[PDB]
Amino acid sequence: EKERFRKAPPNYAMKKTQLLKEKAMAEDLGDQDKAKQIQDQLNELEERAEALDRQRTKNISAISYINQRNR
Amino acid sequence: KDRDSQITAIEKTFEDAQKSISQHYSKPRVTPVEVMPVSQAMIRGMMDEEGNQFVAYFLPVEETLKKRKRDQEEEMDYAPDDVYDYKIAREYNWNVKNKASKGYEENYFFIFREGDGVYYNELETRVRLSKR
Amino acid sequence: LDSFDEFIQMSVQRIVEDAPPIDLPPRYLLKFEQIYLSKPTHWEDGAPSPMMPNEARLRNLTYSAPLYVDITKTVIKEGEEQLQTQHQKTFIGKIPIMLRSTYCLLNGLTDRDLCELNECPLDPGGYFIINGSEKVLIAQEKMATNTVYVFAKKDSKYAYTGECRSCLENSSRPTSTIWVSMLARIGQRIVATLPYIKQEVPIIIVFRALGFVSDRDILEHIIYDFEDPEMMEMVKPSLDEAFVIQEQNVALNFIGSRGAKPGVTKEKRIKYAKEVLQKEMLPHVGVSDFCETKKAYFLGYMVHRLLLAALGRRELDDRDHYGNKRLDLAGPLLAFLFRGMFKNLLKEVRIYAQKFIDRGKDFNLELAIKTRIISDGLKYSLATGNWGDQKKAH
Amino acid sequence: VGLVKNLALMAYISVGSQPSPILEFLEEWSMENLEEISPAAIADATKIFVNGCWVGIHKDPEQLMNTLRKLRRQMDIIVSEVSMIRDIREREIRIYTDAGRICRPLLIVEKQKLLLKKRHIDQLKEREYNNYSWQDLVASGVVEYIDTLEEETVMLAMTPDDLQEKEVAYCSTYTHCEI
Amino acid sequence: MIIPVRCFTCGKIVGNKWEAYLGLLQAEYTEGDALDALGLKRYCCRRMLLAHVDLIEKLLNYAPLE
Amino acid sequence: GNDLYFVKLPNFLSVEPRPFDPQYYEDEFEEEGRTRLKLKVENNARIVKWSDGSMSLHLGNEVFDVYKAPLQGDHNHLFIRQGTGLQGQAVFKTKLTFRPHSTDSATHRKMTLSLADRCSKTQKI
Amino acid sequence: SSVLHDEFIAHRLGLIPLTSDDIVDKLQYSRDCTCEEFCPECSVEFTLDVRCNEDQTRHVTSRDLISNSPRVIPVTSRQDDILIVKLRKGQELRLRAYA
């Protein structure tokens, strides 16, 4: 029960869940499961990448800008 | 899977390169400028010998010795083995015919600016010239 | 990483699928084929999930994939009753994975994901986790295989020794260190230290056993120019030194009379000396039914090259020179193991087939498959550092 | 001291590959196979050596070396990790495809100029912003992995310019340059 | 890990200057003018900002929670 | 009208030699199957030229990124050999002194099953 | 709960300069004050309470050091602030300090 309802991805768990989702996609010979998995994976990726850029929005963002222009 | 998905996405990509181009993975570092739209039988040449079948190292403006390439097959058992040369008199010229070097031939698709048209002209069999 | 990847992709397979089918009263076949390896896991008594390297580190686990194979249990008996029941994906053992390899969970994986796994993006990889210890395989250097060398061990009956560490390609047979050497001193005699023979034999007697009755015919293999009497008069002393043996058969007797197990009957001896000259010596050239004509060429080459060194026409080989060396990376180090570890399990399934047919009952391979051979051998050698079996670890 | 050692920065150790396309290729040149050869035709002919195996005889060794290297640059029949060594003094061509050979990348020289023209630097400076990479220098035949055993035969420069200028002659036959 | 509070040599406070220094590298400055514009005269204090490697930015990627 | 218009592509980017036609196209094909279908739903072409001298080849929103690198082992003439004349009427065009160097890629997947089983049986009596 | 140690925080706090002019020639040395712990006659009390709740990273600066004395502050009066730590989403720092 307790794994079901609460928002799953943040902080580290999304990486293992992404791997698991990939494994679920790969283990299926059915194209419908594959495409549903693909969709699910893309969505969680986007969500996660947003969350990462959000956290890095400040003070990480600033250093990213100086490093790209220094090289 | 399903056929309707395929006909849709193919005929759509015969238009999704014909839209306006303005952003890319390599933007803002670069932006696009202009467009080059898209059987065959190519006679390969040896870089040492430097083959006379088509004069790539000299680029002739007109044939000094012929009206057109009368390049039929080298035998009736040998249709892919074309004569590969720009000759029209019965003269004992030296121009190298296309030998059946399939072993190395491998893949090589060719296309052209066919008046800005959607087509293809992929190569059939990569035959090769020789000092014969 | 590359070394490992080639081991996982192209030496795990090709060590499995190299071994012979086992038989045993009716008898069976029992053949292996395709091999399967999954991402690493820990709970395949909990619910199944991927093991992450950092969890493997923190819990003193062993970062390993389960390993499976396709086995055909094939068997036939009286009445032409036969069957080939296949056990797809039978578990064999657990194989430790090199971090950031082609078969790691940490592969093609972004900085975001590496951080989310609590793992370093800067970590190079290339090491094993064994009981939550990071282990590296140090690249052991060695003299290059299949490549003739010449040296002066002057501290012996030999003025010069030619050498070849002949090897086939990761065979269940190890390398055979052949030597072909020139004695000090008639004077000037030349001998092959062939493998498993009690002692060295004059080279001409080798070519006689190879099947060259004629004198003219042996030297064409060893002396390319018949026009320089320089090299002619050099082999005479050995050519004189074999005039008693002229046919193949008496020749075989001569080598066969010096095996580690010399056969009591004459034909036993010939049966020996025919086998060593086809499988033992110079494997890399071929181990087939008729390869003597090409085994002849390469041996004449070794003699030829010794004659060149002795004439002084060619400079002696340097054993220190790094072109004469190779490096056992994490691929070859492991392939060396996995050979022996797979042989052990074929010894297990053997005795297990036997104890079971003798009852006249039927035998089952699932219990025959001792998982603890691979899983523990690997895990052992990668742990102690001892490159061997635990009982011969000294 | 001296027994435990360390790799160099650009050292690469050969992962290994099968000598089978080489065998197939070498067959269909003007080779002569070992089992169909008259023992009288080994005198004036070069000996071929695949992975330590004397597999063939060739009457022309200046056509092979030029052909084998062109493939080993053009990434097709002979993979980049292979080393081909030509011994001049003794008539021997040795090829290794096996594993464990330590080698390192060098720039190729032709005439007395580098294959690394300013096009490659321009494509390689603009990497990440386009898909180009080190493997394109390999595939374009600009840089080459040379084994220690093949480094025996190179005539190697130490800077592009300074060693390939015009003076009293040192060699004027450079084959490679250091990176 | 994180910019020192003081130049180890002299003792000038450099702890407040790291954000500002990266800000002056968001501007198109040479590091030599960035260091000068912040007022670091000594070649002791100037080493602190040149040489500081900011690893706290990498340690911050290892979230505890969320 | 004549220029460098030869284009090598990898196995997974094999474009049809003929225009798309509904009378020439059929449904035969199906992570495993994901790479399968791509062969004909994608692979008419527009090689876009860029201000840096790079090229991008488009068969969708997916991109192949390309450089006009030189060639020296393949110095042929390109020609439209159509079966009409004596034995394939090769029409002259560009010479193969250059051909595309470019990037087109793929991926893999993951697995998981079980280790050993139970044991320690005991017969009656 | 920061990414640094415990003493790293404490060490960095030590090196922050405090405005001393009006007060330093009034205070007892700690070792000379009669108090069983600390006195306003022998110390100034400081306080840091920081929790990163937001999404962006938290620059723990000398701004966060809250003094009980209005004069013995970090150098903020009249130009950035001494960076102590950087906090992530859910990390915190509570301490009290004496000067």
Ligand SMILES: [Zn+2]
């Ligand atoms: Zn200073």
Ligand SMILES: [Zn+2]
């Ligand atoms: Zn007090």
